[PDB]
mmCIF file of all heavy atoms in Angstrom:
data_model
loop_
_atom_site.group_PDB
_atom_site.id
_atom_site.type_symbol
_atom_site.label_atom_id
_atom_site.label_comp_id
_atom_site.label_asym_id
_atom_site.label_seq_id
_atom_site.Cartn_x
_atom_site.Cartn_y
_atom_site.Cartn_z
ATOM 1 N N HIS I 67 10.711 10.663 -0.661
ATOM 2 C CA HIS I 67 11.104 12.044 -0.826
ATOM 3 C C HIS I 67 12.443 12.286 -0.263
ATOM 4 O O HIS I 67 12.924 11.599 0.657
ATOM 5 C CB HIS I 67 10.173 12.957 -0.200
ATOM 6 C CG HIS I 67 8.765 12.821 -0.693
ATOM 7 N ND1 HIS I 67 8.295 13.567 -1.776
ATOM 8 C CD2 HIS I 67 7.734 12.108 -0.257
ATOM 9 C CE1 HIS I 67 7.030 13.300 -1.973
ATOM 10 N NE2 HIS I 67 6.635 12.412 -1.061
ATOM 11 N N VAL I 68 13.074 13.267 -0.852
ATOM 12 C CA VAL I 68 14.436 13.649 -0.490
ATOM 13 C C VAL I 68 14.610 15.102 -0.949
ATOM 14 O O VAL I 68 14.000 15.548 -1.936
ATOM 15 C CB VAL I 68 15.381 12.773 -1.259
ATOM 16 C CG1 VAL I 68 16.321 13.576 -2.055
ATOM 17 C CG2 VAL I 68 16.004 11.741 -0.403
ATOM 18 N N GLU I 69 15.411 15.798 -0.146
ATOM 19 C CA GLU I 69 15.703 17.198 -0.389
ATOM 20 C C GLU I 69 17.194 17.395 -0.527
ATOM 21 O O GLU I 69 17.930 16.713 0.186
ATOM 22 C CB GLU I 69 15.219 17.980 0.813
ATOM 23 C CG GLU I 69 13.722 18.256 0.845
ATOM 24 C CD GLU I 69 13.429 19.666 0.390
ATOM 25 O OE1 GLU I 69 14.162 20.173 -0.509
ATOM 26 O OE2 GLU I 69 12.556 20.318 1.040
ATOM 27 N N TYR I 70 17.672 18.210 -1.454
ATOM 28 C CA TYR I 70 19.100 18.523 -1.605
ATOM 29 C C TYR I 70 19.149 19.968 -2.122
ATOM 30 O O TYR I 70 18.093 20.484 -2.499
ATOM 31 C CB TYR I 70 19.950 17.533 -2.498
ATOM 32 C CG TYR I 70 19.350 17.118 -3.837
ATOM 33 C CD1 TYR I 70 19.436 17.942 -4.943
ATOM 34 C CD2 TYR I 70 18.675 15.926 -3.982
ATOM 35 C CE1 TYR I 70 18.839 17.580 -6.150
ATOM 36 C CE2 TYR I 70 18.113 15.564 -5.223
ATOM 37 C CZ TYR I 70 18.175 16.416 -6.300
ATOM 38 O OH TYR I 70 17.551 16.129 -7.496
ATOM 39 N N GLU I 71 20.323 20.561 -2.069
ATOM 40 C CA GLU I 71 20.540 21.992 -2.366
ATOM 41 C C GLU I 71 21.745 22.162 -3.231
ATOM 42 O O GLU I 71 22.829 21.548 -3.044
ATOM 43 C CB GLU I 71 20.908 22.661 -1.028
ATOM 44 C CG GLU I 71 20.617 24.149 -0.863
ATOM 45 C CD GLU I 71 21.168 24.704 0.467
ATOM 46 O OE1 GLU I 71 21.175 23.919 1.453
ATOM 47 O OE2 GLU I 71 21.611 25.874 0.558
ATOM 48 N N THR I 72 21.627 23.061 -4.191
ATOM 49 C CA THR I 72 22.804 23.340 -4.962
ATOM 50 C C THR I 72 23.000 24.822 -4.570
ATOM 51 O O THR I 72 22.228 25.374 -3.820
ATOM 52 C CB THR I 72 22.534 23.420 -6.459
ATOM 53 O OG1 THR I 72 21.359 24.215 -6.700
ATOM 54 C CG2 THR I 72 22.390 22.071 -7.009
ATOM 55 N N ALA I 73 24.026 25.404 -5.207
ATOM 56 C CA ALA I 73 24.245 26.829 -5.050
ATOM 57 C C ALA I 73 22.956 27.504 -5.501
ATOM 58 O O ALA I 73 22.397 28.287 -4.791
ATOM 59 C CB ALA I 73 25.309 27.235 -5.966
ATOM 60 N N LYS I 74 22.527 27.149 -6.648
ATOM 61 C CA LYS I 74 21.325 27.773 -7.156
ATOM 62 C C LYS I 74 20.001 27.488 -6.413
ATOM 63 O O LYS I 74 19.136 28.347 -6.269
ATOM 64 C CB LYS I 74 21.173 27.510 -8.670
ATOM 65 C CG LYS I 74 19.865 28.000 -9.322
ATOM 66 C CD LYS I 74 19.716 27.603 -10.728
ATOM 67 C CE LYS I 74 18.903 28.601 -11.576
ATOM 68 N NZ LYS I 74 19.341 28.678 -13.038
ATOM 69 N N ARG I 75 19.794 26.229 -5.984
ATOM 70 C CA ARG I 75 18.501 25.936 -5.369
ATOM 71 C C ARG I 75 18.327 24.875 -4.345
ATOM 72 O O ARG I 75 19.270 24.133 -3.939
ATOM 73 C CB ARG I 75 17.378 25.672 -6.355
ATOM 74 C CG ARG I 75 17.433 26.490 -7.628
ATOM 75 C CD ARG I 75 17.264 25.564 -8.823
ATOM 76 N NE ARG I 75 16.680 26.199 -9.982
ATOM 77 C CZ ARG I 75 16.592 25.623 -11.216
ATOM 78 N NH1 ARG I 75 17.068 24.380 -11.405
ATOM 79 N NH2 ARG I 75 16.076 26.268 -12.234
ATOM 80 N N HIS I 76 17.068 24.820 -3.999
ATOM 81 C CA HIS I 76 16.509 23.849 -3.102
ATOM 82 C C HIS I 76 15.591 22.996 -3.951
ATOM 83 O O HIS I 76 14.677 23.472 -4.607
ATOM 84 C CB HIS I 76 15.703 24.556 -2.015
ATOM 85 C CG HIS I 76 16.546 24.951 -0.801
ATOM 86 N ND1 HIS I 76 16.662 26.260 -0.407
ATOM 87 C CD2 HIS I 76 17.311 24.213 0.013
ATOM 88 C CE1 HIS I 76 17.513 26.321 0.647
ATOM 89 N NE2 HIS I 76 17.883 25.088 0.921
ATOM 90 N N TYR I 77 15.953 21.688 -3.978
ATOM 91 C CA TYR I 77 15.233 20.699 -4.733
ATOM 92 C C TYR I 77 14.636 19.679 -3.756
ATOM 93 O O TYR I 77 15.334 19.132 -2.849
ATOM 94 C CB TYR I 77 16.236 19.912 -5.647
ATOM 95 C CG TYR I 77 16.848 20.745 -6.756
ATOM 96 C CD1 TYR I 77 18.206 21.091 -6.771
ATOM 97 C CD2 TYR I 77 16.065 21.138 -7.806
ATOM 98 C CE1 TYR I 77 18.743 21.950 -7.761
ATOM 99 C CE2 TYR I 77 16.622 21.897 -8.841
ATOM 100 C CZ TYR I 77 17.927 22.325 -8.772
ATOM 101 O OH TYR I 77 18.399 23.132 -9.820
ATOM 102 N N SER I 78 13.341 19.450 -3.937
ATOM 103 C CA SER I 78 12.707 18.388 -3.171
ATOM 104 C C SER I 78 12.499 17.402 -4.330
ATOM 105 O O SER I 78 12.135 17.797 -5.455
ATOM 106 C CB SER I 78 11.407 18.856 -2.593
ATOM 107 O OG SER I 78 10.769 19.683 -3.527
ATOM 108 N N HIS I 79 12.859 16.160 -4.032
ATOM 109 C CA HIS I 79 12.971 15.177 -5.071
ATOM 110 C C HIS I 79 12.268 13.876 -4.770
ATOM 111 O O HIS I 79 12.468 13.210 -3.777
ATOM 112 C CB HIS I 79 14.477 14.973 -5.217
ATOM 113 C CG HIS I 79 14.862 13.805 -6.085
ATOM 114 N ND1 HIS I 79 15.488 13.949 -7.299
ATOM 115 C CD2 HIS I 79 14.830 12.474 -5.828
ATOM 116 C CE1 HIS I 79 15.809 12.761 -7.770
ATOM 117 N NE2 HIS I 79 15.448 11.842 -6.907
ATOM 118 N N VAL I 80 11.385 13.475 -5.711
ATOM 119 C CA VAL I 80 10.677 12.246 -5.475
ATOM 120 C C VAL I 80 11.292 11.062 -6.141
ATOM 121 O O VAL I 80 11.821 11.147 -7.254
ATOM 122 C CB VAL I 80 9.342 12.233 -6.155
ATOM 123 C CG1 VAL I 80 8.304 11.791 -5.195
ATOM 124 C CG2 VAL I 80 9.118 13.544 -6.707
ATOM 125 N N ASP I 81 10.945 9.919 -5.590
ATOM 126 C CA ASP I 81 11.378 8.632 -6.135
ATOM 127 C C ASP I 81 10.405 7.541 -5.664
ATOM 128 O O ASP I 81 10.193 7.370 -4.455
ATOM 129 C CB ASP I 81 12.819 8.390 -5.652
ATOM 130 C CG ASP I 81 13.392 7.133 -6.154
ATOM 131 O OD1 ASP I 81 13.543 7.036 -7.380
ATOM 132 O OD2 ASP I 81 13.938 6.329 -5.299
ATOM 133 N N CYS I 82 9.779 6.846 -6.621
ATOM 134 C CA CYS I 82 8.921 5.699 -6.309
ATOM 135 C C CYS I 82 9.543 4.411 -6.851
ATOM 136 O O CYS I 82 10.380 4.396 -7.771
ATOM 137 C CB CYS I 82 7.465 5.867 -6.676
ATOM 138 S SG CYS I 82 7.083 7.547 -7.242
ATOM 139 N N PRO I 83 9.179 3.389 -6.093
ATOM 140 C CA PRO I 83 9.629 2.029 -6.213
ATOM 141 C C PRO I 83 9.113 1.269 -7.410
ATOM 142 O O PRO I 83 9.823 0.500 -7.994
ATOM 143 C CB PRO I 83 9.109 1.372 -4.934
ATOM 144 C CG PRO I 83 8.685 2.429 -4.066
ATOM 145 C CD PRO I 83 8.261 3.547 -4.936
ATOM 146 N N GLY I 84 7.809 1.457 -7.780
ATOM 147 C CA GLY I 84 7.320 0.708 -8.878
ATOM 148 C C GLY I 84 6.674 1.487 -10.026
ATOM 149 O O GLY I 84 6.210 2.652 -9.854
ATOM 150 N N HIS I 85 6.619 0.800 -11.179
ATOM 151 C CA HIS I 85 6.105 1.425 -12.360
ATOM 152 C C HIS I 85 4.690 1.911 -12.207
ATOM 153 O O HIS I 85 4.298 2.957 -12.733
ATOM 154 C CB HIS I 85 6.238 0.443 -13.511
ATOM 155 C CG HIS I 85 5.714 0.989 -14.816
ATOM 156 N ND1 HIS I 85 6.016 2.313 -15.194
ATOM 157 C CD2 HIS I 85 4.799 0.524 -15.663
ATOM 158 C CE1 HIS I 85 5.356 2.577 -16.312
ATOM 159 N NE2 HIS I 85 4.587 1.513 -16.626
ATOM 160 N N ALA I 86 3.902 1.149 -11.418
ATOM 161 C CA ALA I 86 2.490 1.593 -11.067
ATOM 162 C C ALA I 86 2.545 2.943 -10.365
ATOM 163 O O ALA I 86 1.875 3.911 -10.750
ATOM 164 C CB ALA I 86 1.932 0.625 -10.171
ATOM 165 N N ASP I 87 3.375 2.974 -9.306
ATOM 166 C CA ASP I 87 3.643 4.141 -8.514
ATOM 167 C C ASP I 87 3.873 5.318 -9.428
ATOM 168 O O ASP I 87 3.143 6.306 -9.325
ATOM 169 C CB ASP I 87 4.826 3.934 -7.585
ATOM 170 C CG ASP I 87 4.597 2.824 -6.611
ATOM 171 O OD1 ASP I 87 3.464 2.683 -6.103
ATOM 172 O OD2 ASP I 87 5.529 2.017 -6.264
ATOM 173 N N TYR I 88 4.778 5.205 -10.386
ATOM 174 C CA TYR I 88 4.911 6.365 -11.313
ATOM 175 C C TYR I 88 3.656 6.784 -12.020
ATOM 176 O O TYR I 88 3.410 7.964 -12.283
ATOM 177 C CB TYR I 88 6.049 6.221 -12.302
ATOM 178 C CG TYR I 88 7.384 6.321 -11.649
ATOM 179 C CD1 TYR I 88 7.989 5.206 -11.060
ATOM 180 C CD2 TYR I 88 7.991 7.544 -11.485
ATOM 181 C CE1 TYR I 88 9.195 5.310 -10.351
ATOM 182 C CE2 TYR I 88 9.233 7.684 -10.883
ATOM 183 C CZ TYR I 88 9.819 6.565 -10.260
ATOM 184 O OH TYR I 88 10.964 6.713 -9.552
ATOM 185 N N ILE I 89 2.943 5.791 -12.528
ATOM 186 C CA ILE I 89 1.746 6.100 -13.332
ATOM 187 C C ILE I 89 0.855 6.907 -12.478
ATOM 188 O O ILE I 89 0.478 8.003 -12.825
ATOM 189 C CB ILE I 89 0.965 4.799 -13.568
ATOM 190 C CG1 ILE I 89 1.972 3.738 -13.993
ATOM 191 C CG2 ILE I 89 -0.090 5.022 -14.505
ATOM 192 C CD1 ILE I 89 2.107 3.608 -15.422
ATOM 193 N N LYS I 90 0.512 6.343 -11.307
ATOM 194 C CA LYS I 90 -0.372 6.981 -10.341
ATOM 195 C C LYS I 90 0.078 8.389 -9.935
ATOM 196 O O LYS I 90 -0.634 9.415 -10.149
ATOM 197 C CB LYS I 90 -0.542 6.094 -9.102
ATOM 198 C CG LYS I 90 -1.046 4.646 -9.268
ATOM 199 C CD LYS I 90 -1.367 4.030 -7.878
ATOM 200 C CE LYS I 90 -1.343 2.513 -7.813
ATOM 201 N NZ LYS I 90 -0.583 1.923 -6.622
ATOM 202 N N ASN I 91 1.276 8.444 -9.327
ATOM 203 C CA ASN I 91 1.896 9.689 -8.916
ATOM 204 C C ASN I 91 1.772 10.758 -9.981
ATOM 205 O O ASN I 91 1.032 11.699 -9.790
ATOM 206 C CB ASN I 91 3.362 9.527 -8.549
ATOM 207 C CG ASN I 91 3.908 10.731 -7.751
ATOM 208 O OD1 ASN I 91 4.488 11.645 -8.345
ATOM 209 N ND2 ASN I 91 3.683 10.719 -6.447
ATOM 210 N N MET I 92 2.387 10.563 -11.109
ATOM 211 C CA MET I 92 2.395 11.533 -12.163
ATOM 212 C C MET I 92 1.058 12.003 -12.507
ATOM 213 O O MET I 92 0.915 13.139 -12.881
ATOM 214 C CB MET I 92 3.006 10.968 -13.403
ATOM 215 C CG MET I 92 4.397 10.483 -13.171
ATOM 216 S SD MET I 92 5.409 10.744 -14.608
ATOM 217 C CE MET I 92 6.379 9.348 -14.215
ATOM 218 N N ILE I 93 0.083 11.114 -12.381
ATOM 219 C CA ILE I 93 -1.266 11.456 -12.820
ATOM 220 C C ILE I 93 -2.102 12.182 -11.826
ATOM 221 O O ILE I 93 -2.864 13.086 -12.182
ATOM 222 C CB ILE I 93 -1.998 10.243 -13.311
ATOM 223 C CG1 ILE I 93 -1.589 9.937 -14.720
ATOM 224 C CG2 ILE I 93 -3.443 10.552 -13.381
ATOM 225 C CD1 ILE I 93 -1.889 8.559 -15.142
ATOM 226 N N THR I 94 -2.118 11.685 -10.600
ATOM 227 C CA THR I 94 -2.916 12.361 -9.615
ATOM 228 C C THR I 94 -2.123 13.581 -9.266
ATOM 229 O O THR I 94 -2.541 14.408 -8.473
ATOM 230 C CB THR I 94 -2.891 11.655 -8.300
ATOM 231 O OG1 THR I 94 -1.520 11.725 -7.828
ATOM 232 C CG2 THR I 94 -3.444 10.227 -8.433
ATOM 233 N N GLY I 95 -0.899 13.675 -9.743
ATOM 234 C CA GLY I 95 -0.031 14.820 -9.406
ATOM 235 C C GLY I 95 0.127 14.939 -7.893
ATOM 236 O O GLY I 95 -0.056 16.032 -7.349
ATOM 237 N N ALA I 96 0.441 13.817 -7.224
ATOM 238 C CA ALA I 96 0.706 13.848 -5.776
ATOM 239 C C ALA I 96 1.704 14.973 -5.470
ATOM 240 O O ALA I 96 1.453 15.964 -4.773
ATOM 241 C CB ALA I 96 1.331 12.480 -5.331
ATOM 242 N N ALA I 97 2.864 14.807 -6.149
ATOM 243 C CA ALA I 97 4.017 15.699 -6.141
ATOM 244 C C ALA I 97 4.220 16.154 -7.637
ATOM 245 O O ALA I 97 4.270 15.301 -8.555
ATOM 246 C CB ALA I 97 5.245 14.977 -5.620
#
């Protein structure tokens, strides 16, 4: 996880290391 800000907003941003990680994450809707 990582957070950054633009004029317009506050973005909390995910990033996973492996293709499995994406499958799982997106699905269980961790974030």
Side-chain angles (χ1 to χ4, degrees):
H67 302 271
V68 124
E69 280 260 34
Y70 46 81
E71 205 185 330
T72 47
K74 174 186 209 148
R75 323 132 153 171
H76 272 120
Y77 293 110
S78 38
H79 169 113
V80 230
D81 180 66
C82 353
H85 180 43
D87 298 322
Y88 289 85
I89 313 267
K90 302 191 204 133
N91 196 266
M92 303 214 210
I93 278 159
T94 63

